[PDB]
Short mmCIF file of C-alpha atoms (C1' of nucleotides) and ligand atoms in Angstrom, two decimals:
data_model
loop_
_atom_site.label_atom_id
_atom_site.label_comp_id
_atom_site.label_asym_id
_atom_site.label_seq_id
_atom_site.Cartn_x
_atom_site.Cartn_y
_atom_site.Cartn_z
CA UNK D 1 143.29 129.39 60.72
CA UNK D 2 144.51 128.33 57.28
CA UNK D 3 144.50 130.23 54.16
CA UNK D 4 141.87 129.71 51.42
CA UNK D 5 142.89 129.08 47.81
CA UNK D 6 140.73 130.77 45.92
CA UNK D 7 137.21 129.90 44.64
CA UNK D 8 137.45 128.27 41.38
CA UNK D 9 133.71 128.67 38.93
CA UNK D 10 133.34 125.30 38.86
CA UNK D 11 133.86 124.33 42.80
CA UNK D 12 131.48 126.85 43.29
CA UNK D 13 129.20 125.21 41.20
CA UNK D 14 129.27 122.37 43.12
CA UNK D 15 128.86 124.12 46.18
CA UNK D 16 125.35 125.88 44.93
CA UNK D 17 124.18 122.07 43.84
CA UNK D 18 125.24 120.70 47.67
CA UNK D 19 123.31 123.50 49.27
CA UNK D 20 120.16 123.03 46.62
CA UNK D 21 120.20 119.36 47.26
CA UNK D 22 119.90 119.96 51.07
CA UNK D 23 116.87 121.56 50.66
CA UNK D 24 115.30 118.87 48.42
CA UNK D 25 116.55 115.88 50.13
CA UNK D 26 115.15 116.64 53.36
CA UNK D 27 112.20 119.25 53.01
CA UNK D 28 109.00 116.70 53.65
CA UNK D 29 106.85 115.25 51.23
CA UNK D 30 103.23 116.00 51.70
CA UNK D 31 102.41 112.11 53.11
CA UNK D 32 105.11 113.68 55.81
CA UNK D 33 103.24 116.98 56.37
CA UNK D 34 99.97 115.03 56.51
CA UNK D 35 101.29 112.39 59.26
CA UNK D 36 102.74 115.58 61.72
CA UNK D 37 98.70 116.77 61.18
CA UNK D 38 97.65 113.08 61.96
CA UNK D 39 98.91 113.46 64.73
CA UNK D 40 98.33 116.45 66.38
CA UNK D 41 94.87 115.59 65.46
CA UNK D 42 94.79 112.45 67.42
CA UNK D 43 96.46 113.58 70.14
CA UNK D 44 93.90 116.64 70.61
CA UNK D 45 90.90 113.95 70.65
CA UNK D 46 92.66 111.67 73.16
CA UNK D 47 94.06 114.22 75.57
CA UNK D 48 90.17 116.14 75.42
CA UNK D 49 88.51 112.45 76.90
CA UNK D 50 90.49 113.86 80.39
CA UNK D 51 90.95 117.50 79.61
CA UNK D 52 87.93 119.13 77.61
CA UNK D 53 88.59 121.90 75.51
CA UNK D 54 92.46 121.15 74.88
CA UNK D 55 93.54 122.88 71.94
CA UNK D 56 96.96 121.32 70.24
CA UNK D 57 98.93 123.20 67.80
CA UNK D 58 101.83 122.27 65.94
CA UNK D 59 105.34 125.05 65.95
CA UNK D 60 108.78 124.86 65.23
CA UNK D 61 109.86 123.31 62.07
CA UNK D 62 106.82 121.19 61.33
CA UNK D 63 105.40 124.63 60.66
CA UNK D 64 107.67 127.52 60.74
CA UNK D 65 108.89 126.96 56.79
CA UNK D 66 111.98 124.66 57.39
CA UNK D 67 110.65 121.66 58.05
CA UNK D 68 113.20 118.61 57.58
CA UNK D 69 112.47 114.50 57.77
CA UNK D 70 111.79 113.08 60.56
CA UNK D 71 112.49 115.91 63.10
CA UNK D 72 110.65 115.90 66.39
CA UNK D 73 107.08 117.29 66.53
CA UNK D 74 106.77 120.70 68.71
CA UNK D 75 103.43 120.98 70.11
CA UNK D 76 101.51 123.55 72.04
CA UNK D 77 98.97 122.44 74.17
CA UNK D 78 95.95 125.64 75.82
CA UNK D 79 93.13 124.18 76.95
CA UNK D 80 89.66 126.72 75.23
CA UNK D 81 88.21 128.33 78.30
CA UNK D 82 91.17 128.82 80.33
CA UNK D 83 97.72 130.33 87.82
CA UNK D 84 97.95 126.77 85.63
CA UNK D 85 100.42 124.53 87.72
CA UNK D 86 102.53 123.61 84.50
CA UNK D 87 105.05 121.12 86.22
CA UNK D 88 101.44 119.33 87.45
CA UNK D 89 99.81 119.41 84.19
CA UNK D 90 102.88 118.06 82.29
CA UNK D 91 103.02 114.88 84.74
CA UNK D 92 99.23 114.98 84.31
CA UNK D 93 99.48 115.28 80.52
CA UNK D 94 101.99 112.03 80.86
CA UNK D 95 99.28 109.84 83.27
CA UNK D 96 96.73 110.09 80.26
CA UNK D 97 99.20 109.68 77.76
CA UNK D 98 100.66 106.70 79.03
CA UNK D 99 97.13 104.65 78.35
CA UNK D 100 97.32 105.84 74.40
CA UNK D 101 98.50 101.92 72.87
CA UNK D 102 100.03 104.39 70.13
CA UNK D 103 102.49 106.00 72.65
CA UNK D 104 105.63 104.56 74.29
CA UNK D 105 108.07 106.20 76.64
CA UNK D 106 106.20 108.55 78.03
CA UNK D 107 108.43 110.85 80.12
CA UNK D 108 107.54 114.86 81.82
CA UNK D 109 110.13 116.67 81.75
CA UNK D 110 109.06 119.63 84.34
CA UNK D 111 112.11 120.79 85.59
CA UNK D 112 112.94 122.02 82.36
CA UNK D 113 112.75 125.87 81.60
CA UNK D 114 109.96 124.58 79.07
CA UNK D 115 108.70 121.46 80.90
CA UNK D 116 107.41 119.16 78.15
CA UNK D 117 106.12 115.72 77.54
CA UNK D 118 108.07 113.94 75.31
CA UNK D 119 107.03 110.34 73.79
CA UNK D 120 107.60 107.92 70.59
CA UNK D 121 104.46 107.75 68.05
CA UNK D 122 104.32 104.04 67.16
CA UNK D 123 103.28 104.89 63.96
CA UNK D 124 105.39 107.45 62.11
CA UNK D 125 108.40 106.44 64.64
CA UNK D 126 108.70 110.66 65.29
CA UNK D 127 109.51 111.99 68.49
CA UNK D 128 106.84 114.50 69.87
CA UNK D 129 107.45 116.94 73.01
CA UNK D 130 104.20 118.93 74.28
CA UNK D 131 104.56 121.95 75.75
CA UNK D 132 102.01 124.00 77.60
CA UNK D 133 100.61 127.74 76.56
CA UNK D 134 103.82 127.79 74.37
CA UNK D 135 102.69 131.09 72.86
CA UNK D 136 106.07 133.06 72.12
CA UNK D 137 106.81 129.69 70.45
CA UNK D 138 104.02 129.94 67.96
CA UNK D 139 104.92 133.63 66.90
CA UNK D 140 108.71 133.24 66.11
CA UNK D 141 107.13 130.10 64.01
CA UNK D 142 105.37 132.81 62.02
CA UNK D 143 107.92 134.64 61.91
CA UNK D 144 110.84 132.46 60.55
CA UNK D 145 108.12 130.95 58.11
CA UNK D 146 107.86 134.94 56.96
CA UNK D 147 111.49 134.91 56.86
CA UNK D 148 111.33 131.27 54.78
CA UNK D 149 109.36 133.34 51.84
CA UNK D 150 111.40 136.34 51.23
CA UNK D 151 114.01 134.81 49.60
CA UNK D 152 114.68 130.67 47.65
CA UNK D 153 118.19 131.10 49.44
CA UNK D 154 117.08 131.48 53.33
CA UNK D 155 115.67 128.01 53.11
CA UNK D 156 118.72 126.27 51.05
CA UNK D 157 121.24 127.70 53.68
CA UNK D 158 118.67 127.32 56.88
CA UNK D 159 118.76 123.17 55.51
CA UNK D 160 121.91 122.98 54.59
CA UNK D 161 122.95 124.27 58.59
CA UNK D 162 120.28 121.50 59.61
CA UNK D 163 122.25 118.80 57.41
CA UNK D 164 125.70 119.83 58.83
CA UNK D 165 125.05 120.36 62.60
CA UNK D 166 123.19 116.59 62.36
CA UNK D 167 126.57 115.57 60.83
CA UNK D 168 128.53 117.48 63.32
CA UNK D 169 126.55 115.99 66.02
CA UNK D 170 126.25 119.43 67.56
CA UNK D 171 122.74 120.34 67.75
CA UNK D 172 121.36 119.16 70.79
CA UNK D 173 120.39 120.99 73.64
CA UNK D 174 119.59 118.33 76.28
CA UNK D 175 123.42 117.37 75.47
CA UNK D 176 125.05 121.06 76.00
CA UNK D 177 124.93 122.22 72.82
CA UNK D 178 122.81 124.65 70.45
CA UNK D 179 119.61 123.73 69.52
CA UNK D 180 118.24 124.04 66.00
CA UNK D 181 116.52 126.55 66.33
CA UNK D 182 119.34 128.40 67.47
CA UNK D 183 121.74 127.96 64.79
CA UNK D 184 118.68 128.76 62.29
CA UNK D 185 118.68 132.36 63.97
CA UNK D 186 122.62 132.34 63.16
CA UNK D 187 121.83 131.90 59.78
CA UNK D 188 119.03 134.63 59.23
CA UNK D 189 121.64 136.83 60.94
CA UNK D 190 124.15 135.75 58.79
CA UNK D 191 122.03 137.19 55.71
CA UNK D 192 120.82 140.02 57.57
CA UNK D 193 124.31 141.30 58.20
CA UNK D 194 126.17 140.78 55.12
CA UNK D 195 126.83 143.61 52.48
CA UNK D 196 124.37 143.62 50.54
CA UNK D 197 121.43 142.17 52.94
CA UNK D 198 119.58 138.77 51.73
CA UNK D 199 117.07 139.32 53.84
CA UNK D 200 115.96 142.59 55.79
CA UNK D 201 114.57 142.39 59.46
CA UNK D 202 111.12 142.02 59.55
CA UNK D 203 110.28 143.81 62.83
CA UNK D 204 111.88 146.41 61.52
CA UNK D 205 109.88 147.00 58.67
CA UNK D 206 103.63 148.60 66.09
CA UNK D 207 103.44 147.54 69.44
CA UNK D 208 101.55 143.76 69.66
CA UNK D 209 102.07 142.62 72.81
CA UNK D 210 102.13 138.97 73.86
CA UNK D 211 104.02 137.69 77.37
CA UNK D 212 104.86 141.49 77.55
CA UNK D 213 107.16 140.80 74.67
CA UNK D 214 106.31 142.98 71.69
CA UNK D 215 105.70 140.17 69.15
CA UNK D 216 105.11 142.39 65.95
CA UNK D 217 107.41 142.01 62.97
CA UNK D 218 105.96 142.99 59.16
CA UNK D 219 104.43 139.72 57.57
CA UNK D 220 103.26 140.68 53.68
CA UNK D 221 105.80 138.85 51.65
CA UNK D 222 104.32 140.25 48.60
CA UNK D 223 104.72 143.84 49.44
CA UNK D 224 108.64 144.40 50.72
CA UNK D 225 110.07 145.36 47.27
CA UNK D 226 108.06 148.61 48.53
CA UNK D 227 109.24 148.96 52.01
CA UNK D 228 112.48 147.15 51.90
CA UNK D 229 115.40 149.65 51.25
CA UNK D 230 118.06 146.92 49.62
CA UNK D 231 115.44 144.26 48.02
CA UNK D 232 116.63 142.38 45.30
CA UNK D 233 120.21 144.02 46.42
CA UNK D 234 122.47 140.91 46.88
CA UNK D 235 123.00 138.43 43.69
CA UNK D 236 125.51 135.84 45.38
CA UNK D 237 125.33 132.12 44.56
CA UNK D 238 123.56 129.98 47.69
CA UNK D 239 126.67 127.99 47.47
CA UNK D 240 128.85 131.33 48.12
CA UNK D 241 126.39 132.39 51.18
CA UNK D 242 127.06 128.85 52.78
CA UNK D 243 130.92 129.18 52.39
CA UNK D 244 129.92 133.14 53.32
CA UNK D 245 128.25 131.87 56.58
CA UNK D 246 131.32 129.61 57.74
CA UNK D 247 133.64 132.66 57.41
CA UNK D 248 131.33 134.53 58.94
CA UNK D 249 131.93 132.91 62.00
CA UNK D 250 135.03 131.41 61.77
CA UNK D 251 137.15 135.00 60.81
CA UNK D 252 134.52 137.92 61.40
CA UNK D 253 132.29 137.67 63.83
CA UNK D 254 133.28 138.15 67.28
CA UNK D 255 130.94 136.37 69.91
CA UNK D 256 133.31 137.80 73.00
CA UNK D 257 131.35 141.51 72.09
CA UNK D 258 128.34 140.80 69.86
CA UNK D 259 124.90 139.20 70.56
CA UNK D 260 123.11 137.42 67.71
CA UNK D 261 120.14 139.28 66.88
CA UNK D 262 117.63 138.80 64.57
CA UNK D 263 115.36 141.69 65.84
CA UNK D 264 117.00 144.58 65.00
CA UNK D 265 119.95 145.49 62.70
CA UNK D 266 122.18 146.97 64.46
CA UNK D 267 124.95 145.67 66.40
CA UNK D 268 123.91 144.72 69.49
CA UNK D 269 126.80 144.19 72.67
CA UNK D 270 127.34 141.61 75.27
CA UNK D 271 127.54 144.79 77.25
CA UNK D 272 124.32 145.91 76.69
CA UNK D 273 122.32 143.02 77.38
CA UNK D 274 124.58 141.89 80.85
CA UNK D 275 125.21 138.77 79.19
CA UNK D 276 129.08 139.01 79.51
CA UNK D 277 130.08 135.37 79.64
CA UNK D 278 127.74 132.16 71.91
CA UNK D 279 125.56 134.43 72.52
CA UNK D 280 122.20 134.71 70.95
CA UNK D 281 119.20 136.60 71.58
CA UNK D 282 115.51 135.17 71.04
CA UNK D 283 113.45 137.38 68.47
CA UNK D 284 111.12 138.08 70.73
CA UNK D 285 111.69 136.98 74.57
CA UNK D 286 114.80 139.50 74.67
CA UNK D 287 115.40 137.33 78.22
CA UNK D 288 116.07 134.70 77.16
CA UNK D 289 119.61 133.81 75.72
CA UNK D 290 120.08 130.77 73.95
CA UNK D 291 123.67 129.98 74.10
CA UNK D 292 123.22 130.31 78.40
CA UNK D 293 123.34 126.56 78.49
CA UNK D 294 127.08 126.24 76.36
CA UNK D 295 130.21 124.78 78.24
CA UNK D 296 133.16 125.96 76.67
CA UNK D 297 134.03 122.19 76.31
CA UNK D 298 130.85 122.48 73.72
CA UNK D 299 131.36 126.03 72.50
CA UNK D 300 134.53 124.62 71.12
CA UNK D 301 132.83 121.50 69.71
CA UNK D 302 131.28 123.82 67.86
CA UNK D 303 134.04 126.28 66.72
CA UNK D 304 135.86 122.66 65.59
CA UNK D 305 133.25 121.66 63.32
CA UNK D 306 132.84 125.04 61.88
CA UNK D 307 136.42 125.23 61.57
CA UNK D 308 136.86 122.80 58.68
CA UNK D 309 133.67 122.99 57.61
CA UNK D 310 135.18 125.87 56.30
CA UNK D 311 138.08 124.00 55.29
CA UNK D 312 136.45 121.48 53.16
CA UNK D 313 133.60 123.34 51.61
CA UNK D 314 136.66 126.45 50.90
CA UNK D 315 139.07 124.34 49.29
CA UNK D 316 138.72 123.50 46.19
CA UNK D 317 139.18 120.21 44.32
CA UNK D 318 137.85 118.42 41.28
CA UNK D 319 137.23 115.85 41.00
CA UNK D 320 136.45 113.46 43.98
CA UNK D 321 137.45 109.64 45.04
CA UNK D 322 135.17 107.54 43.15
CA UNK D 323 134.80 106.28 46.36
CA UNK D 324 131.87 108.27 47.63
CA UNK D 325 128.39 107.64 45.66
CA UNK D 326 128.37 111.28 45.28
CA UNK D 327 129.19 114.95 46.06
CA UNK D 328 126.93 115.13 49.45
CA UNK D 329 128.67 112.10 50.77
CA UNK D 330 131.98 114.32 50.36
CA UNK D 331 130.94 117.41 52.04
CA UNK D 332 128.78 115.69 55.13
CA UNK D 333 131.65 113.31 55.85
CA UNK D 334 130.97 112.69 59.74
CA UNK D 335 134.42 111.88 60.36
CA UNK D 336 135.63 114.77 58.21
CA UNK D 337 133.72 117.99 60.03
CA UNK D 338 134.86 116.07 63.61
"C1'" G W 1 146.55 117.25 98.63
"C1'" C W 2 146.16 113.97 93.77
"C1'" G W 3 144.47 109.82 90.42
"C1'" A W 4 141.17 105.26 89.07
"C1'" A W 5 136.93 102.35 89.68
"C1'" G W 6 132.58 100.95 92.17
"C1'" C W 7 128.21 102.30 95.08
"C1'" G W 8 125.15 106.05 96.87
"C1'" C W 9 123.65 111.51 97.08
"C1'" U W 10 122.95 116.50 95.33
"C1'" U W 11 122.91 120.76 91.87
"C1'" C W 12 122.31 122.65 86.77
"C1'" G W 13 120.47 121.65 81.81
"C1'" C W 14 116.46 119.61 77.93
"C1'" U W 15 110.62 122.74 73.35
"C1'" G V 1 114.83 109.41 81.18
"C1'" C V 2 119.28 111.84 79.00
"C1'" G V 3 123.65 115.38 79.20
"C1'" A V 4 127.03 118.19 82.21
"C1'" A V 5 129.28 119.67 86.98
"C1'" G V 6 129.81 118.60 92.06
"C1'" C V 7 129.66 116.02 97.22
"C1'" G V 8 129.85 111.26 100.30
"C1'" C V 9 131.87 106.49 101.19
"C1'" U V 10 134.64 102.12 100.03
"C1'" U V 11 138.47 99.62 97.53
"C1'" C V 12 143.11 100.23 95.10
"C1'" G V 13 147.03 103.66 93.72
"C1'" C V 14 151.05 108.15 95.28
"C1'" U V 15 158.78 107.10 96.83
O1 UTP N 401 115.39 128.24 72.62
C1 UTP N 401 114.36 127.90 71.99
C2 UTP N 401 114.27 126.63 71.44
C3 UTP N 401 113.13 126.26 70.74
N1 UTP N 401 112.13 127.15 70.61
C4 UTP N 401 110.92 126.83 69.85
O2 UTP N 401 110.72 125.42 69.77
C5 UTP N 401 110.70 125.00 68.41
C6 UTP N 401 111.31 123.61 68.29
O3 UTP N 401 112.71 123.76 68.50
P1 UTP N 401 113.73 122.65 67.98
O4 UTP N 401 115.02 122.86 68.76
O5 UTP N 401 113.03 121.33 67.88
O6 UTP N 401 114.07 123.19 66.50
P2 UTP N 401 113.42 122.62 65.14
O7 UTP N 401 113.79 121.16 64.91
O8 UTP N 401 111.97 123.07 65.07
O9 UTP N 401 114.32 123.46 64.10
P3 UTP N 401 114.09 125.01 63.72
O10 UTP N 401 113.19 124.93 62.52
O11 UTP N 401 113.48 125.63 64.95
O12 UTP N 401 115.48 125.53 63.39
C7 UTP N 401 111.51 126.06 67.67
O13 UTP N 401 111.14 126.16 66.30
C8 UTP N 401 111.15 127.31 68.43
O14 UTP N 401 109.92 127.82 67.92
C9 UTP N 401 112.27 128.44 71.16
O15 UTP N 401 111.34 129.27 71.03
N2 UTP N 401 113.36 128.78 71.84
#
RNA sequence: GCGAAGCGCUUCGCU
RNA sequence: GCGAAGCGCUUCGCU
């Protein structure tokens, strides 16, 4: 790795107006919001002509307090009322779905560890996958969208991690990489681990039980300054935290030993869990790992791209080529980060 | 035993 | 469907 000249004010500056911008470039307008609940309404009506009592519900970042233009909708599909066959009722879900004049490409996916229906909505050109009894999804929505309140700098780094993996072309999980969701958990354990804490861990801070999984994590965002030992602890600059993250792990972290985990503080060990050989643990099913899919082809994809994204968000320069529009243009450089 | 392409076949993955 | 990793066969290659 190369040595970092050291952060000038200004180039920081810039950094905290990239990260900001992120956030306000891509969070959705509420015409946006509206459409997502368009369609889940619509859907709910069509699929209940066939299935009666089918219940959709929207998770993931349409709802969990990151949501970003023109990502795919996550839906959860129970029916009220109700051994379910789910790789049947996926390819059942796709034989109704395929007669909606709104819908094209229909395709089940049921061999999938969460078989889903994915399609194209004519009208808002989003992709939407449908999943079935999804429930663990809609908690660690709740959850992240907890974590989304505490603090105005979880969001601007969470978005600015959604800008640069799109960039980097390294957030997709059908291709071998990590999904979003994924690298958001990297993030809020990012800012749970550094000295001081942004955030603290919210299941932390009960035993509800859903899929066996204890699903309980503390939820009043207006009452931590109480029960939160290091609240209003860490002052540092979003932009800082961003260029903090890609140190993080590019120099510190080391994902040979230690399993990213949200859940609890402490470390926890690729010992521990029998998950020897990125490694990241879901808040709440503690079975499942996310990174279980990764080549090392794509694991170093990844380590690439957030190798000089450290590099050009840690050097400094002012100005830039009047050649790029503006600073963002800079920064995401496709070509750049790969 | 090794490489390239084509045509088939299988296994794993996808919220 | 898409991504990855294999197996079959054929054709052409191995100094
Ligand atoms: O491994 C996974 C992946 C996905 N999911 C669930 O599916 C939802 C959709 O997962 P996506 O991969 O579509 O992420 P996203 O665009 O919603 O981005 P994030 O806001 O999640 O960063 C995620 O929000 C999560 O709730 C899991 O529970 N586990």
């Amino acid at each position: 790795l190369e040595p970092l000249p050291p952060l000038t004010p200004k180039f920081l500056n810039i950094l905290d107006q990239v990260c900001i911008q992120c956030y306000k470039d891509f969070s959705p307008t509420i015409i946006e919001d509206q459409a997502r609940e368009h369609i889940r309404q619509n859907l709910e009506s069509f699929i209940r002509q066939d299935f009666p009592g089918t219940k959709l519900s929207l998770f993931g970042s349409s709802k969990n307090g990151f949501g970003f233009k023109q990502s795919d909708l996550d839906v959860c599909m129970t029916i009220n009322g109700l051994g379910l066959d789910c790789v049947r009722t996926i390819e059942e879900l796709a034989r109704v779905l395929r007669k909606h004049s709104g819908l094209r490409n229909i395709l089940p996916i049921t061999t999938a560890k969460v078989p889903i229906v994915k399609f194209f909505h004519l009208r808002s050109g989003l992709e939407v996958d449908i999943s079935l009894y999804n429930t663990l999804a809609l908690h660690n929505t709740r959850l992240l969208s907890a974590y989304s309140a505490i603090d105005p700098r979880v969001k601007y780094l969470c978005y600015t991690m959604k800008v640069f993996t799109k960039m980097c072309d390294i957030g997709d999980a059908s291709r071998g990489s990590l999904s979003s969701y994924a690298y958001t958990l990297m993030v809020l354990y990012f800012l749970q681990q550094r000295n001081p804490p942004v955030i603290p861990v919210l299941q932390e801070i009960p035993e509800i039980f859903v899929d066996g999984w204890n699903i309980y994590f503390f939820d009043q965002i207006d009452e931590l300054p109480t029960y939160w030992s290091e609240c209003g602890k860490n002052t540092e600059s979003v932009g800082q935290l961003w260029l903090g993250l890609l140190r993080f792990y590019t120099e510190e972290f080391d994902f040979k030993e230690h399993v990213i985990s949200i859940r609890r503080k402490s470390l926890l060990t690729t010992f521990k869990k029998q998950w020897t050989s990125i490694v990241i643990e879901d808040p709440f099913d503690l079975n499942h790992n996310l990174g279980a899919g990764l080549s090392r082809k794509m694991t170093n994809f990844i380590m690439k791209a957030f190798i000089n994204g450290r590099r050009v968000f840690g050097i400094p320069v002012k100005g830039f080529p009047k050649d790029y529009p503006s600073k963002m243009e800079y920064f995401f450089d496709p070509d750049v980060l790969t």
